[PDB]
Write an enzyme that holds these catalytic residues in place. Structure first.
Site, short mmCIF file in Angstrom:
data_model
loop_
_atom_site.label_atom_id
_atom_site.label_comp_id
_atom_site.label_asym_id
_atom_site.label_seq_id
_atom_site.Cartn_x
_atom_site.Cartn_y
_atom_site.Cartn_z
N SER A 191 -9.71 8.92 1.17
CA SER A 191 -9.01 8.13 0.12
C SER A 191 -9.82 7.01 -0.21
O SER A 191 -11.00 7.09 -0.77
CB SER A 191 -7.46 7.73 0.51
N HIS A 244 -1.29 14.52 1.01
CA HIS A 244 -2.42 13.31 1.20
C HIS A 244 -2.41 12.93 2.56
O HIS A 244 -1.28 12.33 2.84
CB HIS A 244 -2.34 12.32 0.24
N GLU A 250 -2.25 16.67 -2.88
CA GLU A 250 -2.36 15.24 -2.94
C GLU A 250 -1.29 14.47 -3.46
O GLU A 250 -0.70 13.15 -2.57
CB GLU A 250 -3.65 15.10 -3.67
N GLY A 300 -6.02 2.46 0.09
CA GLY A 300 -5.89 1.75 -1.39
C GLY A 300 -6.90 0.47 -1.51
O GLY A 300 -6.54 -0.27 -2.44
N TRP A 316 1.05 4.97 9.36
CA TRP A 316 -0.13 4.42 8.67
C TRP A 316 -0.39 2.79 8.78
O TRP A 316 -1.33 2.14 8.61
CB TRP A 316 -0.13 4.62 7.14
#
Ligand SMILES: *[C@@H]1O[C@H](CO[C@H]2O[C@@H](C)[C@@H](O)[C@@H](O)[C@@H]2O)[C@@H](O[C@@H]2O[C@H](CO)[C@@H](O)[C@H](O)[C@H]2NC(C)=O)[C@H](O)[C@H]1NC(C)=O
Ligand SMILES: *[C@@H]1O[C@H](CO[C@H]2O[C@@H](C)[C@@H](O)[C@@H](O)[C@@H]2O)[C@@H](O[C@@H]2O[C@H](CO)[C@@H](O)[C@H](O)[C@H]2NC(C)=O)[C@H](O)[C@H]1NC(C)=O
Ligand SMILES: *[C@@H]1O[C@H](CO[C@H]2O[C@@H](C)[C@@H](O)[C@@H](O)[C@@H]2O)[C@@H](O[C@@H]2O[C@H](CO)[C@@H](O)[C@H](O)[C@H]2NC(C)=O)[C@H](O)[C@H]1NC(C)=O
Ligand SMILES: *[C@@H]1O[C@H](CO[C@H]2O[C@@H](C)[C@@H](O)[C@@H](O)[C@@H]2O)[C@@H](O[C@@H]2O[C@H](CO)[C@@H](O)[C@H](O)[C@H]2NC(C)=O)[C@H](O)[C@H]1NC(C)=O
Ligand SMILES: *[C@@H]1O[C@H](CO[C@H]2O[C@@H](C)[C@@H](O)[C@@H](O)[C@@H]2O)[C@@H](O)[C@H](O)[C@H]1NC(C)=O
Ligand SMILES: *[C@@H]1O[C@H](CO[C@H]2O[C@@H](C)[C@@H](O)[C@@H](O)[C@@H]2O)[C@@H](O)[C@H](O)[C@H]1NC(C)=O
Ligand SMILES: *[C@@H]1O[C@H](CO)[C@@H](O)[C@H](O)[C@H]1NC(C)=O
Ligand SMILES: *[C@@H]1O[C@H](CO)[C@@H](O)[C@H](O)[C@H]1NC(C)=O
Ligand SMILES: *[C@@H]1O[C@H](CO)[C@@H](O)[C@H](O)[C@H]1NC(C)=O
Ligand SMILES: *[C@@H]1O[C@H](CO)[C@@H](O)[C@H](O)[C@H]1NC(C)=O
Ligand SMILES: *[C@@H]1O[C@H](CO)[C@@H](O)[C@H](O)[C@H]1NC(C)=O
Ligand SMILES: *[C@@H]1O[C@H](CO)[C@@H](O)[C@H](O)[C@H]1NC(C)=O
Ligand SMILES: *P(=O)(O)N(CC)CC
Ligand SMILES: *P(=O)(O)N(CC)CC
Ligand SMILES: [Cl-]
Ligand SMILES: [Cl-]
Ligand SMILES: [Cl-]
Ligand SMILES: [Cl-]
Ligand SMILES: [Cl-]
Ligand SMILES: [Cl-]
Ligand code: NA
EC number: 3.1.1.8
Lengths: 527, 527
Positions: free
Chosen positions: A196, A436, A323, A115, A80
């Site tokens: 997300s 998730h 999740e 986020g 990520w």
């Protein structure tokens, strides 16, 4: 050689062999002026026009952002983290087109999650070359500003209005409207998709008047703007903007001066202080996110949703079976990706404090009451399983189901999936289950690459999702029509039918987490 | 001391402590004249009346029957073999009553399975003392004649009319009508329940005019009269009766003489020849079963079902997830309870010959075509899993679903369950999964006995089924109303909602094996 003429100049792409075929990729096309100096914290400014050939032959800089350092060397986490240089000069996008140049192809526009504090379009799991090759759609993705640089708000004031990074996405949807015919694309058939925070983003463009006519349909994977992490209040945003100023010695009294001071700071100083703008946060903290700015967002979006004030079109909305689990190793006592994480009741309790910081004591007992009526009190992984369900039901699953209900009550077709397949290649331990973020590589077709160590049942599973995603985009209906597939029913209030996605048999079921979400949805908002 | 007066005499029962409480048990009450000598092969004759006290203090003789010798010493198989002496003098029943004597208790009457060739009411898994204790119903069970002794047919002729063993069950339902108030029971609230051939039996009493007014409701576990094994044709029954005669040197020309000769034979000679009355059979052979006799059964029962000619009342109907597996170790090549039984395509093929003896070649290719379109051809247990599904879908699941549909189309409430829990104590190997016959101990409450090595989740699971079974019997509605249980929807044509029974979460689903049963149900009957 492949040169396409755009409204601002020519761009050269590169050929790629995918599955004995060819996709053209234009990686790194700029779509706005770089948001440096005087432009930092402001709305993206349109791009000037360049003669000569812009070479779109590699991914561009990712936007400035803090990085996940929790598990150095660990692929689960580091997959990520950004994989191109960070720079404020990150306002670029990627186009992948089938070869030969399609005539009037449907367009899929990807909006990454993270986020709103992190992420980048150039991750391997967001590589749209398989979609282009396999379904002959065009794939577009864009970088947009995250953290304070992208969402710092001092409400009403254009030097830092809020939502800049949503405006970056928007200006990118605009570039597709103006430019994508040149590439063989149909601007009148564009579907936004994202995961997300990227999905919450898709849901707010459904709410934004300025985005209404820049796309056709929306797909929301594990996210919607009614999730508790998705919109910062005006109250909190100011606190945070002032707290940021304070921490960089930029406290002023002229808010326009606070900003000028913040624009002298250097990206690292800003990044370095973000985490502390809040007295406490959680692994799910969104310090600088979307706000009601009276521009992109005209009113609290819960009010817009309830009262039917959103673009009328089909939606596809989904979540994953586990999740919540991924978050528990970022601060919940007794959790670890390196063991089976059997925690105790008292650990479960300290974990609610982790995830539910302020947080009446009775609020938290109520979560414990709802989630710990064991059946039965024997099973040692009882409390480990409950903490993750708590986290993913509160943060993702119930808010996605409530969005889908409310949206559908205004008359549009809506389809809801429950993703239940755990990747054969997952690096995270078994107990974290169907995590998730781990449907994305199925959506993007990475399992169609056989070179790649996924099972056969995974290729088939991903080929089917690709087909459903693409049929949704082109035709507003996520059916796989050729292979005796289970038919995907629309989601209605009343029935709430959803489709399960897994390697064995896909099912039609109803009322996902009915009992859990009654809790999150009716009761908890009260505490 | 506990003496109850019955229409034919007094009977003494025995007290039993169950779960810190007491049930009275009257084991071994006779309900007809012993069907010996002149009475062999005839309809049960009513019982004479005895002064003095008949002592009902132990289980009686089981009816004559061949025994399963395939796995000597193996509890999985031998738990089904008879556990009281065999004798033709086996026409007895059992009553279990709550203590204190209930006032007007609902009655559950159990009818065992065993292919109509075997079985007995005194098995441990049919012990109704837990139901009496826990739900305060009365439990009744009866022995009835199986094999040729119970179903030999020479159509029209009262010396061997057919269906004697169904008449034994009937005369027992009669004894309950006349006698059960004495015991505290309500004759006006009787529910028949039974498994496999015992369930097919329950479904034919739904069709029999003589049984209509001897019960209120029916429960059918893994069985219905439309299953392929459940009704012998007139053609086949004659062949078989003559083949039997032939094998015992009893061929005559006066059919009444064939029978008189057969009545001189001794039970073993008859038993010993049953298996060969058919050129070939299968592990699922029912050599001597129900026939259309113009008495108990007035017409082919498929015609009665289709045209709505059955008692109108609620039904509860169910099956288990792996009905077929148990049969594969009784003659399918490459199968064994002592290994994982990965068979080959060619083995699968030879197995269809085992289960589908005559059996057009195209019939069998068609089964292979339907069941071997792998997803995908990788998985080594593919053909092992397909053979069992073939067997249980053909023999149990689709015929139970088709019965339920057709029955419900005439207006009555019907509830269908899918039993998916594998016993923690199953002696059969894992690959045989949720086997035929293994819900019974949950229905009868054996897991409520904690002394007994079942998990906690199994006690809870069985307590719930007991409660649903008992509510169905008393109130026609199989709900567990107190513990936030999933509500059990009626089964309708159109929706075909069924409820899943397992330890984790019970679900509402729809259209069990829709694709499989379209095959068995529309197409196969044609081959
Ligand atoms: C709105 O902001 C204030 C600011 O408090 C913060 O100062 C920042 C620069 C940063 O370092 C941050 O970690 C720090 O807490 C918050 O006031 C604080 O709140 C906590 C609990 O109420 C107190 O223990 C602190 O002492 C207090 N600080 C001061 C100086 O007043 C306030 O909580 C915040 N609102 C929220 C809860 O988000
Ligand atoms: C599973 O691991 C967790 C995580 O903590 C540990 O990580 C382990 C893999 C190991 O390296 C260990 O030394 C490291 O601290 C364990 O939780 C920890 O429990 C220990 C035992 O005292 C405490 O000291 C820690 O406070 C706690 N860590 C934190 C901060 O959460 C956990 O006990 C272990 N449990 C198992 C095996 O189920
Ligand atoms: C109807 O019955 C006849 C009787 O055949 C049988 O003789 C019995 C006493 C018994 O031993 C049995 O195993 C034996 O087959 C059946 O005729 C037989 O059928 C098979 C195949 O058709 C032949 O190979 C036999 O040779 C033949 N026997 C005789 C003497 O004619 C007949 O098949 C049966 N119908 C069915 C299929 O159920
Ligand atoms: C699983 O076992 C079956 C059953 O056959 C065997 O039972 C074993 C447990 C063992 O005692 C063996 O000797 C016994 O015969 C095996 O199927 C058998 O395969 C063997 C190998 O040649 C053949 O000889 C038999 O014809 C066949 N038995 C029959 C009649 O069905 C099977 O191979 C074994 N397979 C595994 C381990 O997956
Ligand atoms: C390309 O097709 C155009 C319209 O196609 C779309 O119609 C929209 C209303 C929407 O439903 C999309 O999903 C459809 O695919 C047409 O008007 C253009 O002229 C076409 N352009 C070409 C071929 O150059
Ligand atoms: C016992 O109750 C009798 C009837 O109860 C039943 O009504 C039936 C129609 C059926 O619905 C059953 O399920 C009901 O429970 C009543 O007529 C008898 O008189 C009662 N006998 C007593 C108390 O001695
Ligand atoms: C664009 O790439 C091509 C490679 O053939 C070449 O013309 C040139 O080096 C590039 N232009 C640049 C580097 O600005
Ligand atoms: C604050 O001073 C700054 C200096 O640029 C200016 O932006 C703004 O007009 C001033 N606001 C007032 C009226 O105090
Ligand atoms: C449809 O079926 C074929 C062959 O059975 C398979 O190769 C392909 O993956 C399937 N296509 C889709 C869209 O799933
Ligand atoms: C019935 O059992 C009781 C035991 O107390 C006794 O009266 C008698 O032995 C029995 N009657 C028989 C054996 O026929
Ligand atoms: C056959 O003979 C037997 C001898 O009892 C008898 O039952 C029957 O009447 C006879 N049937 C005829 C008329 O052949
Ligand atoms: C209902 O709940 C109690 C306590 O939670 C439990 O002991 C009992 O098994 C349940 N009863 C039924 C009918 O399942
Ligand atoms: P998503 O972008 O992963 N996110 C919602 C805030 C989870 C951290
Ligand atoms: P059931 O009585 O077990 N039976 C139906 C024929 C399976 C052998
Ligand atoms: Cl438990
Ligand atoms: Cl499917
Ligand atoms: Cl659920
Ligand atoms: Cl496979
Ligand atoms: Cl439940
Ligand atoms: Cl199914
Ligand atoms: Na509450």
């Amino acid at each position: 050689d492949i040169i396409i003429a755009t409204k601002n100049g020519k761009v050269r792409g590169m050929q790629l062999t995918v599955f004995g075929g060819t996709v053209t990729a234009f990686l790194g096309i700029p779509y706005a002026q770089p948001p440096l100096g005087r432009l930092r914290f402001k709305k993206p400014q349109s791009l000037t026009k360049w003669s000569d050939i812009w070479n779109a032959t590699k991914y561009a800089n990712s936007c400035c952002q803090n990085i996940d350092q929790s598990f150095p060397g660990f692929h689960g986490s580091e997959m990520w983290n950004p994989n191109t240089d960070l720079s404020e000069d990150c306002l670029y996008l990627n186009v992948w087109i089938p070869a030969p140049k399609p005539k009037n192809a449907t367009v899929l526009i990807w909006i990454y999650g993270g986020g709103f504090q992190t992420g980048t379009s150039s991750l391997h799991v967001y590589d749209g070359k398989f979609l282009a090759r396999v379904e002959r759609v065009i794939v577009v993705s864009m970088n947009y500003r995250v953290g304070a640089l992208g969402f710092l708000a001092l409400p009403g004031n254009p030097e830092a209005p809020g939502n800049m990074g949503l405006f970056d996405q928007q200006l990118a949807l605009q570039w597709v409207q103006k430019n994508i015919a040149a590439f063989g694309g149909n601007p009148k058939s564009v579907t936004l998709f994202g995961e997300s925070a990227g999905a919450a983003s898709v849901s707010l463009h459904l709410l934004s008047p300025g985005s209404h006519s820049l796309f056709t349909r929306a797909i929301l994977q594990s996210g919607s703007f009614n999730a508790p992490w998705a919109v910062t209040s005006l109250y909190e945003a100011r606190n945070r903007t002032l707290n940021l100023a304070k921490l960089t010695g930029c406290s002023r009294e002229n808010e326009t001066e606070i900003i000028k001071c913040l624009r002298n700071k250097d990206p690292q100083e800003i990044l370095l202080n973000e985490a502390f703008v809040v007295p406490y946060g959680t692994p799910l903290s969104v310090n600088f996110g979307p706000t009601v700015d009276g521009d992109f967002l005209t009113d609290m979006p819960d009010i817009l949703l309830e009262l039917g004030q959103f673009k009328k079109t089909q939606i596809l909305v989904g979540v994953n079976k586990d999740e919540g689990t991924a978050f528990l190793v970022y601060g919940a006592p007794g959790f670890s990706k390196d063991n089976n994480s059997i925690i105790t009741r008292k650990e479960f309790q300290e974990g609610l404090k982790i995830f539910f910081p302020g947080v009446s004591e009775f609020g938290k007992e109520s979560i414990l009451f709802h989630y710990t009526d064991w059946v039965d009190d024997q099973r040692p992984e009882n409390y480990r399983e409950a903490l993750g369900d708590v986290v993913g039901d509160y943060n993702f699953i119930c808010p996605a189901l409530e969005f889908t209900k409310k949206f559908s009550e205004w008359g549009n077709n809506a389809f809801f999936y429950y993703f239940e397949h755990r990747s054969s290649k997952l690096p995270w331990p078994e107990w974290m289950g169907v995590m998730h973020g781990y449907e994305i590589e199925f959506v993007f077709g990475l399992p169609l690459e056989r070179r790649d160590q996924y099972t056969k049942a995974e290729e088939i599973l991903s080929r089917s999702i690709v087909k459903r995603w693409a049929n949704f985009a082109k035709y507003g209906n996520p059916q796989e029509t050729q292979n005796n597939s289970t038919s995907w029913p629309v989601f209605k209030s009343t029935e709430q039918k959803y489709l399960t996605l897994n390697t064995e048999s896909t099912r039609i079921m109803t009322k996902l987490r009915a009992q859990q979400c009654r809790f999150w949805t009716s009761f908890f908002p009260k505490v």
